[PDB]
Design a protein around this ligand. Sequence first.
Ligand SMILES: *[C@@H](O)[C@H](CC(C)C)NC(=O)[C@H](CC(C)C)NC(=O)[C@H](CC(C)C)NC(=O)OCc1ccccc1
Length: 220
Amino acid sequence: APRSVDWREKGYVTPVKNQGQCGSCWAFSATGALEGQMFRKTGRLISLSEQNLVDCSGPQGNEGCNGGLMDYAFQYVQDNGGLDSEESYPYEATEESCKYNPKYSVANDAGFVDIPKQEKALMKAVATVGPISVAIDAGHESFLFYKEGIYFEPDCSSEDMDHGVLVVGYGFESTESDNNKYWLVKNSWGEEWGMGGYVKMAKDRRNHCGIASAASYPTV
Ligand SMILES: *[C@@H](O)[C@H](CC(C)C)NC(=O)[C@H](CC(C)C)NC(=O)[C@H](CC(C)C)NC(=O)OCc1ccccc1
């Protein structure tokens, strides 16, 4: 595989969004991956409605602001026959009744693909598919205060993930400890967090924070 990948440079990634005080990260991860695959298909980048997923994908197993899974979101888009644009169904950071309108659907998928639980497989998927939905252990103060550099948290769990995010690439940079590889991750906490909303997460360090443990993307 390549040693560096950044799908932002190829037009696959919308700007950083902000889930607010709603446990809807899974929806932002899901729209991010679907935005990328829709762009792969049509050559048009359209921001998608996380609120549509928060309000409507309960029957697939999601629980609004109380948590969800990206794969359940991909199943909803398939089952439902569409997903509205961000513009048509904007984000309110609270769960409401479903207001999906098929007239404003701009995205579809025919299922999803779960990636083997290995960083080697995740790298191959990032290199060849596009942005990949992943789950990580983000429950540490170090993650809140992240400014720059490669994020490494010794107390991070590789099995107990609690936050869905989007891998948009990977790369390297020289460091004091010579742990130089990172995943480029788009978060959903706004631009003021991290590096313009992004974090470089330790790569090839025993599946740090579980980033390869629940990786998937929609089939478009
Ligand atoms: C982030 O905004 C949000 C916070 C709320 C839980 C308050 N996190 C999630 O929704 C979280 C993301 C996943 C990808 C880790 N989902 C869950 O915690 C999930 C919610 C249920 C209601 C679907 N709970 C769970 O046990 O998910 C199973 C799982 C977790 C990790 C990998 C595979 C499967």
